[PDB]
Amino acid sequence: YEHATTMPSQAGISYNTIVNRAGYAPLPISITPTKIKLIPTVNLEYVTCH
Amino acid sequence: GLDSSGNLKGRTMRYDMHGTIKEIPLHQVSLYTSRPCHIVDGHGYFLLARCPAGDSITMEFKKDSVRHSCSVPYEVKFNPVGRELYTHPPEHGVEQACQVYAHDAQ
Amino acid sequence: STEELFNEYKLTRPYMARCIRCAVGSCHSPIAIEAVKSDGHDGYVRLQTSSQYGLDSSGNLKGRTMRYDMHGTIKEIPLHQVSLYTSRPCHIVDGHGYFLLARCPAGDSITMEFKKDSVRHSCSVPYEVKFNPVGRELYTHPPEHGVEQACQVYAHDAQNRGAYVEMHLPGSEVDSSLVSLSGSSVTVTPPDGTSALVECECGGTKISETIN
Amino acid sequence: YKTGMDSPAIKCCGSQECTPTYRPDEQCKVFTGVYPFMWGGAYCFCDTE
Amino acid sequence: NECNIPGNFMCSNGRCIPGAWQCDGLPDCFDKSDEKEC
Amino acid sequence: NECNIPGNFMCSNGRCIPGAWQCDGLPDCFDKSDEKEC
Amino acid sequence: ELTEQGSATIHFSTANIHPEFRLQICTSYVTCKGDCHPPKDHIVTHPQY
Amino acid sequence: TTMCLLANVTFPCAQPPICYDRKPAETLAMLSVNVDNPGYDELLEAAVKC
Amino acid sequence: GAFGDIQSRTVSSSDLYANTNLVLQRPKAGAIHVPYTQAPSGFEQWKKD
Amino acid sequence: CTVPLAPEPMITFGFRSVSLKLHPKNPTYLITRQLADEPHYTHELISEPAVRN
Ligand SMILES: [Ca+2]
Ligand SMILES: [Ca+2]
């Protein structure tokens, strides 16, 4: 059963929802994001010092 | 199955050789269609082998230095059972009914 | 030193196993073929058999031998008595432990066979053996000459690279030739220097680990 | 790939259970009503079970 | 028990041999099951 | 020099024999190079 | 089976998206009214009831 | 380094106490618990020979 | 039966994803072996395509 | 006689449709027919990986 939703990009806060199939019992879905990284593609050119 | 006189003997071939009936053991006789076959048993004029498919059949034995052979152009064919067309029978699978040559000489 | 590389297979023994296509029917065979791997190019397969190679019946080194099991009793022959074929005859290169390196043409099965004084042993398994050419000119026997290309073949020497197979304790093999009938009781004669165990349900539940 | 196989665990007149090793794509089915064989004759001595 | 192929004799170990190999004076079964009651 | 095959030993005449035939106790190369320095 | 003051539960099968039928129970007719919903499977392995 | 196991004795894996021509099944019991070991090859190659 | 039925994250990752449609079958009467059925290797079929 | 056994087809369901992914080991007949007055049967020999809708 294809179910699409949307979650805000904010850590710590639990995000709750359910899935209502039209003649069955509602299925609850919970997603709590903990740590959301962002890792760029990093390319060393040179180092320097004294 | 007969000895060179007329009585029982286990795994032997009996053959005419210019009048004088001779004999050899049956593990000295090889035969092949395309691959080598495997003789199971013999009884009178008939032999039960296990051959793969091929477009001829060659039987040969070897004396001390004289080699004898016969090749005839008879199609030897392989037949699977059921709706999967194997060339060599498998190691496992569902049991199925078939129709093979009986090993005994009954 | 090659003995530091053969030292692993001193720890092990050959065994008998099930071959569905033997010399007459479906037997228990000394030369059961566990696998055939043929992923190199110019015709080189790698059998994993039930026998062992390069070792004699005690556990030392001999050059070209096959060490198989025979109902418990571990026997040997030279390697040039063993032949195998797929559709044409193959050509054995060498062996090391449970493995062998042949030079086989393409076909749909492997049939290893050797011959004793009168008993002929065989094992055929329906494993496809495939032949892989290099480049963009499809041959079937490699040519006399041309140019050279980067191929991958199975190596001709045993050498410790990062790939392992797994050993285990053997189970108990029931052997009939031990139990015999006396006048009124059941006589069990375990082999010399070797324990056994007998389980019966002639009276009640029974277990006894007898030693010689 | 290479399908790894385990050696068959036979209990003579008993019953067995499934112990998961969590290996990849691992299957473990248990078959009753067996009468297995070695080279030295029959292995178990029961007819069923 | 019974061999799958009809004209066969079954040894002690389950190996099926031809029926003309039973009681022939040559051992074929492990522990001679074709050489017991001849 | 070097053999094309991954694991072969090259004789004096250039014939490549496998690596476990070097110092094994049998002559394989013409004039036995494999059996010189063991 | 009927008790004195209990409640009997039956199972039925339909094609109706708004089923409504008179249920005869041994003398009398009671009206059963509701709204059915589409099932979860496309292809099943038993014929139609 | 890496210490193999035969008992509660953390011994160096290249220094075996025993050999295979001495004990039939104690080298085998040493290779029992030492399967999950990054020095299994060192242990075996040092542990067969004297 | 297609590309990537075996997925190891690196070459020596010691954690592989296997979806090979492996099914265990019932052994033959009087035989100790593990029979199985599975879809063939998809890396070989990808080399064939 | 012991006969082989093909791999399990991978059945994907849709509205009034069945798809079949078929990976055969050796060539294998797929025989379909409808359970109506017109069966419309289909006797096919599949030797390669093939999808049949
Ligand atoms: Ca006999
Ligand atoms: Ca040499």
Side-chain angles (χ1 to χ4, degrees):
Chain A
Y1 186 72
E2 182 69 24
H3 176 71
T5 185
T6 304
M7 184 177 73
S9 178
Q10 187 173 2
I13 301 169
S14 299
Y15 178 71
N16 288 315
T17 186
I18 58 174
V19 174
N20 289 319
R21 186 75 81 92
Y24 290 141
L27 187 63
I29 293 173
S30 176
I31 294 173
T32 78
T34 295
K35 189 180 286 186
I36 299 170
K37 298 183 181 180
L38 188 148
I39 302 169
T41 302
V42 186
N43 203 169
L44 178 64
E45 287 196 354
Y46 60 92
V47 302
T48 183
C49 63
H50 295 91
Chain B
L2 294 91
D3 62 356
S4 176
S5 66
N7 294 316
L8 286 167
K9 190 174 282 188
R11 282 76 155 172
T12 53
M13 186 179 75
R14 181 177 74 183
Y15 62 95
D16 191 359
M17 189 64 201
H18 297 292
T20 63
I21 288 169
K22 296 178 183 178
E23 66 174 359
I24 57 170
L26 194 62
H27 70 273
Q28 292 295 112
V29 179
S30 68
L31 85 170
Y32 58 90
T33 54
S34 299
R35 297 170 173 86
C37 297
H38 295 94
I39 296 171
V40 179
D41 200 0
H43 174 85
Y45 285 110
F46 293 90
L47 195 147
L48 185 66
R50 186 184 67 200
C51 287
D55 55 355
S56 71
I57 175 73
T58 296
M59 179 180 282
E60 63 181 4
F61 67 97
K62 187 175 71 176
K63 189 50 69 175
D64 301 332
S65 295
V66 176
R67 185 176 178 178
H68 300 284
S69 298
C70 185
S71 298
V72 291
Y74 294 162
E75 183 181 2
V76 175
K77 59 187 177 183
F78 184 81
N79 298 122
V81 180
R83 275 90 66 196
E84 304 190 11
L85 299 176
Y86 56 93
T87 312
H88 193 281
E91 296 174 351
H92 56 272
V94 297
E95 297 299 355
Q96 184 174 358
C98 65
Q99 289 178 355
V100 299
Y101 290 102
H103 293 81
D104 58 354
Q106 187 174 5
Chain C
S1 178
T2 62
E3 189 177 2
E4 192 178 0
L5 280 71
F6 278 94
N7 62 358
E8 294 188 354
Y9 293 96
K10 294 181 181 179
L11 297 169
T12 59
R13 70 183 181 93
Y15 59 94
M16 292 176 71
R18 181 176 182 271
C19 186
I20 203 164
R21 177 54 67 89
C22 298
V24 172
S26 176
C27 69
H28 296 285
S29 185
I31 51 176
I33 305 164
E34 294 291 327
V36 174
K37 303 299 180 185
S38 63
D39 291 330
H41 286 93
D42 281 329
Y44 292 94
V45 306
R46 179 178 65 195
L47 284 81
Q48 179 179 0
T49 64
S50 182
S51 299
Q52 287 180 354
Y53 300 92
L55 279 74
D56 55 353
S57 178
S58 65
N60 293 319
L61 301 186
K62 199 182 289 185
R64 283 79 157 175
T65 51
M66 180 180 72
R67 181 181 72 183
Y68 63 96
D69 191 1
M70 192 68 201
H71 298 286
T73 63
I74 297 170
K75 296 181 182 180
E76 69 172 359
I77 58 168
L79 193 62
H80 65 273
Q81 299 299 113
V82 176
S83 70
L84 81 161
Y85 57 91
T86 60
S87 299
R88 292 175 177 87
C90 296
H91 291 94
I92 303 173
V93 179
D94 203 358
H96 177 82
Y98 290 124
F99 294 95
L100 188 149
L101 191 69
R103 189 179 69 194
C104 279
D108 50 354
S109 66
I110 281 287
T111 300
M112 181 176 286
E113 67 186 5
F114 70 101
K115 183 171 70 176
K116 191 50 71 174
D117 291 330
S118 294
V119 176
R120 186 181 183 181
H121 294 280
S122 296
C123 189
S124 296
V125 286
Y127 292 162
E128 179 178 359
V129 171
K130 56 191 177 182
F131 185 83
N132 300 112
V134 185
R136 277 93 65 193
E137 302 188 8
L138 301 176
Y139 51 87
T140 311
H141 192 276
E144 311 187 357
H145 54 270
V147 297
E148 341 275 310
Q149 288 199 5
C151 60
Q152 292 177 351
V153 297
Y154 287 103
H156 289 47
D157 58 353
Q159 188 173 359
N160 205 158
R161 304 178 191 184
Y164 296 104
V165 289
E166 184 172 357
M167 300 183 294
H168 285 277
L169 285 172
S172 302
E173 301 176 333
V174 48
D175 187 349
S176 294
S177 293
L178 302 179
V179 47
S180 67
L181 279 175
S182 178
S184 66
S185 294
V186 172
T187 300
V188 172
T189 66
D192 47 353
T194 302
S195 178
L197 72 155
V198 181
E199 292 185 357
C200 306
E201 206 267 327
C202 69
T205 307
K206 189 262 190 299
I207 181 167
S208 295
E209 294 179 350
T210 181
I211 300 170
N212 202 0
Chain D
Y1 59 84
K2 183 178 178 182
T3 300
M5 287 174 283
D6 199 2
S7 295
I10 302 163
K11 184 181 282 183
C12 292
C13 268
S15 176
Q16 287 284 110
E17 288 290 328
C18 297
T19 63
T21 319
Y22 292 157
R23 284 170 173 171
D25 202 1
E26 185 178 1
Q27 301 294 321
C28 180
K29 194 174 180 180
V30 50
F31 298 106
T32 185
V34 185
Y35 191 75
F37 281 149
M38 293 290 287
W39 53 268
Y43 189 87
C44 294
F45 58 92
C46 304
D47 287 329
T48 61
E49 297 177 354
Chain E
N1 206 165
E2 292 292 328
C3 292
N4 290 178
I5 311 297
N8 278 323
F9 176 72
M10 186 174 176
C11 291
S12 300
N13 55 355
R15 176 184 171 179
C16 291
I17 63 171
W21 285 3
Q22 185 183 7
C23 289
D24 54 355
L26 295 174
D28 286 328
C29 294
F30 172 67
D31 285 7
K32 48 275 187 177
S33 179
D34 54 351
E35 296 295 325
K36 286 186 179 179
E37 294 183 355
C38 298
Chain F
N1 207 166
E2 288 294 327
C3 293
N4 302 116
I5 317 299
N8 270 338
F9 175 73
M10 182 172 176
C11 296
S12 301
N13 55 358
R15 172 185 176 182
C16 294
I17 63 170
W21 290 0
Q22 185 179 2
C23 287
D24 56 352
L26 296 175
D28 289 328
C29 272
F30 174 61
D31 274 353
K32 321 170 193 177
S33 179
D34 52 351
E35 293 290 324
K36 286 181 180 179
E37 296 178 356
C38 297
Chain G
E1 182 178 0
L2 295 172
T3 60
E4 290 180 352
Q5 292 298 110
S7 296
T9 298
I10 61 169
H11 300 286
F12 62 96
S13 181
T14 184
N16 291 314
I17 197 168
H18 296 286
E20 184 179 0
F21 56 93
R22 298 179 70 193
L23 184 68
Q24 177 178 359
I25 176 165
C26 310
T27 55
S28 66
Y29 297 94
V30 293
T31 304
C32 298
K33 184 186 288 185
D35 290 330
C36 281
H37 302 99
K40 62 183 182 181
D41 287 334
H42 292 85
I43 308 293
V44 293
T45 57
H46 62 87
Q48 184 177 1
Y49 287 163
Chain H
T1 62
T2 301
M3 297 297 174
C4 292
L5 293 172
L6 189 146
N8 55 5
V9 177
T10 60
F11 62 94
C13 297
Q15 294 180 356
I18 56 175
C19 294
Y20 177 67
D21 59 353
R22 295 183 182 273
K23 298 291 180 68
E26 288 185 352
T27 64
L28 314 198
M30 185 176 70
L31 299 176
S32 300
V33 73
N34 295 317
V35 175
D36 296 332
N37 193 2
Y40 179 82
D41 195 2
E42 297 177 354
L43 178 64
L44 174 140
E45 289 182 353
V48 176
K49 294 174 72 174
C50 184
Chain I
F3 188 84
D5 50 358
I6 295 300
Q7 287 171 345
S8 176
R9 178 70 73 186
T10 60
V11 187
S12 64
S13 177
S14 294
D15 194 1
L16 70 93
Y17 176 74
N19 190 3
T20 60
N21 199 3
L22 177 63
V23 176
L24 291 172
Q25 302 297 325
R26 189 178 185 274
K28 202 137 123 196
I32 298 170
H33 61 85
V34 176
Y36 65 100
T37 309
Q38 62 178 349
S41 179
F43 180 65
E44 177 66 32
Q45 183 61 44
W46 182 74
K47 284 168 69 176
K48 292 181 187 177
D49 293 336
Chain J
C1 313
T2 195
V3 296
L5 195 62
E8 300 290 328
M10 283 171 280
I11 307 169
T12 301
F13 301 119
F15 174 66
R16 298 171 73 90
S17 181
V18 165
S19 184
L20 291 172
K21 284 175 68 179
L22 262 47
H23 297 285
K25 184 177 184 291
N26 48 11
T28 303
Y29 289 97
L30 177 68
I31 306 170
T32 71
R33 57 102 173 261
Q34 293 180 356
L35 303 179
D37 48 356
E38 293 181 354
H40 293 287
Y41 73 98
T42 302
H43 183 74
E44 186 181 2
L45 175 65
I46 292 170
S47 301
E48 298 181 356
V51 177
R52 293 292 187 269
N53 297 327

